[PDB]
Amino acid sequence: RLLDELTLEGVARYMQSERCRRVICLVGAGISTSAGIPDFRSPSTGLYDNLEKYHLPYPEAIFEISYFKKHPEPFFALAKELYPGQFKPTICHYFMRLLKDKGLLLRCYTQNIDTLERIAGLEQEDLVEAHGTFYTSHCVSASCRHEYPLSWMKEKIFSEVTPKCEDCQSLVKPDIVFFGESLPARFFSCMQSDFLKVDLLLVMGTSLQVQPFASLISKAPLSTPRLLINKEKAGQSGGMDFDSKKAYRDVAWLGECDQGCLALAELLGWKKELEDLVRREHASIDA
Amino acid sequence: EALPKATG
Ligand SMILES: *CCC[n+]1cc(CCCCCCCCCCCC)n([C@H]2O[C@H](COP(=O)(O)OP(=O)(O)OC[C@H]3O[C@@H](n4cnc5c(N)ncnc54)[C@H](O)[C@@H]3O)[C@@H](O)[C@H]2O)n1
Numbered sequence: 001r002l003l004d005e006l007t008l009e010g011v012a013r014y015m016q017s018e019r020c021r022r023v024i025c026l027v028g029a030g031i032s033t034s035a036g037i038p039d040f041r042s043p044s045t046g047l048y049d050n051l052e053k054y055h056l057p058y059p060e061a062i063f064e065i066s067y068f069k070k071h072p073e074p075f076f077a078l079a080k081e082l083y084p085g086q087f088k089p090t091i092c093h094y095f096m097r098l099l100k101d102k103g104l105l106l107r108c109y110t111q112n113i114d115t116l117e118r119i120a121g122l123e124q125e126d127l128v129e130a131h132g133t134f135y136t137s138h139c140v141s142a143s144c145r146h147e148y149p150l151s152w153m154k155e156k157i158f159s160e161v162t163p164k165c166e167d168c169q170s171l172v173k174p175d176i177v178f179f180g181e182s183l184p185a186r187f188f189s190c191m192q193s194d195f196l197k198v199d200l201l202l203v204m205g206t207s208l209q210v211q212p213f214a215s216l217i218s219k220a221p222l223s224t225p226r227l228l229i230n231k232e233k234a235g236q237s238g239g240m241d242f243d244s245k246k247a248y249r250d251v252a253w254l255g256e257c258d259q260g261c262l263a264l265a266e267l268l269g270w271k272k273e274l275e276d277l278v279r280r281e282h283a284s285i286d287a
Numbered sequence: 288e289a290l291p292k293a294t295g
Pocket residue numbers: 027028029030031033034037039040041042046063078079082083084111112113114131134176177178179180181205206207208209210211229230231232234255256257258292293294295
């Protein structure tokens with residue numbers, strides 16, 4: 001075992017050693033809840049328990065491509081509803097920023113579509129936006145694919161006018177991977193190389209229930225330590241083994257992502273760095 | 288045929 005204690009402090013000591021050179025982050029909606037964007041499956045606060053106004057066969061249809069092509073109005077209504085007043089990345093986003101600035105971040109695979117990793121300062125080469133982004137949008141006709149900027153999408157969404165392509169009159173969809181859509185080729189290109197060389201998996205804010213993203217946790221070498229920072233355990237059957245008498249490399253820290261990243265940063269000696277980074281960047285944003 | 292799709 002590469003960790004000497006299955007605790008946050010043992011992970012921090014490992015990250016300070018010279019074996020730990022390449023860290024992969026796998027992040028989900030949980031790392032953005034403290035920024036105002038709700039997640040999907042948390043009780044009462046999650047989106048899946050706020051979708052009766054839209055009458056749906058299943059709650060996930062509002063994010064499924066065939067239902068969208070037949071009934072796009074619920075999705076764009078939810079879009080106008082949830083569009084935040086501000087886009088401020090969280091302590092966890094800036095913790096990943098610090099991993100980048102210190103040459104430790106091999107890649108961040110994200111399920112989020114809010115572009116907060118980008119705003120935190122993670123560049124395209126650092127990111128695998130496995131499920132796309134809300135930032136750009138395209139006509140759904142594969143022979144047209146006319147692109148439209150977020151400003152046009154916002155005018156059409158807030159005017160409550162279903163977006164249509166000025167060439168086909170076809171539907172215009174934000175560049176999100178809906179259920180039943182193929183993941184980008186970059187995902188499968190990065191996956192083949194990244195998980196042969198990874199020294200640490202950092203999983204944060206995800207229930208690990210959407211495929212093939214979740215299978216990423218099992219692509220690492222069997223000696224690679226894996227730290228979950230999440231309000232609840234996830235990824236248990238590869239497969240996260242936290243509790244068993246055979247456990248040897250998986251550590252779970254149950255709590256807020258922001259609190260766990262503060263704690264890990266302090267254990268690393270990066271506490272003041274992270275605090276100043278968050279202040280300076282939230283200031284440049286609030287301007 | 289296509290690349291693997293998003294699945295629950
Ligand atoms: C195959 C493709 C399936 N697919 C597509 C999408 C994208 C849908 C985008 C919808 C956008 C609509 C407009 C919104 C505009 C917003 C402004 C721009 N998805 C998405 O669904 C999946 C969600 O999975 P997840 O793992 O990311 O999230 P869950 O809600 O299931 O689990 C969250 C997890 O975190 C814990 N938690 C919550 N809050 C926490 C804090 N503060 N600290 C720690 N832990 C926290 C919860 O307990 C839970 O375990 C993704 O695939 C996403 O892409 N799917």
